[PDB]
Amino acid sequence: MRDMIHNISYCLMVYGTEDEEKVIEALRNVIPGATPERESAEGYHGNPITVLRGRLDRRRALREFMEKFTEVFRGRMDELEDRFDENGNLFLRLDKQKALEGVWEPVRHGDAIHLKIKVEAYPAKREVAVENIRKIL
Ligand code: NI
């Protein structure tokens, strides 16, 4: 058995014209059952937002996520390789509008669902994390 990932931190924003329920529906197409904490902040162009944040470590959610992550990113490792940090983490941003339609679309900038994925890796280093995910993909 492998843990694969230790936990997932997530962040996404709700702008003034957005329906928070649909934003959360989009998040739940990436992490079903996610129940984010709310906090008021400023987003793009200083627009007031609610930030929806969470740190998820529930085994059932992590495993379901890895199942979908694996289907999505099988043979697409070259799209992820540069998104790892020096500490084992994989940073993945997905298009929020696409998520609402049930599609995982990696993006680099813009309005996204931000995931900070703590990859099971020892030593907790970029190369180890990369190798581990590539093997999975
Ligand atoms: Ni601007």
Q: How far is the CA of 109 from the centre of ligand 1 (A)?
A: 12
Q: How far is the CA of 42 from the centre of ligand 1 (A)?
A: 13
In 3D space, the residue among 24, 95, 11, 14 whose CA is nearest the CA of residue 47 turns out to be 14
d(CA 64, CA 67): 5
Q: How far is the CA of 112 from the centre of ligand 1 (A)?
A: 16
Q: CA dist 121 to 25, 30, 84, 87, 128, Å?
A: 31, 23, 12, 9, 6
Residue with token string 């008021």: 40
In 3D space, the residue among 129, 97, 137 whose CA is nearest the CA of residue 113 turns out to be 97
Q: How far is the CA of 120 from the centre of ligand 1 (A)?
A: 37
Number of domains in the chain: 1
Q: How far is the CA of 99 from the centre of ligand 1 (A)?
A: 24
Q: Tell me, what CATH number does 16's domain have?
A: 3.30.1440.10
Please, what's the b/e burial string for 110-134 (b: 16 or more CB within 10 A of its CB; e: otherwise)?
ebbbbbebbbbbeeeebebbbebbe
CB contact at 8 A, 133 and 119: yes
In 3D space, the residue among 9, 15, 12 whose CA is nearest the CA of residue 96 turns out to be 12
Experimentally, the structure was elucidated by: X-ray
Residue with token string 């902040």: 41
- Domain hosting 17: range is 1-137
Q: How far is the CA of 46 from the centre of ligand 1 (A)?
A: 10
Neighbour-count burial of 3, counting CB atoms closer than 10 A to its CB (0-12 exposed, 13-18 middle, 19+ buried):
middle
Q: Specify the length of the chain in residues.
A: 137
d(CA 131, CA 51): 32
Q: How far is the CA of 136 from the centre of ligand 1 (A)?
A: 38
Resolution in A: 2.0
Q: How far is the CA of 45 from the centre of ligand 1 (A)?
A: 6
Q: How far is the CA of 95 from the centre of ligand 1 (A)?
A: 18
Q: CA dist 72 to 19, 75, 109, Å?
A: 27, 9, 20
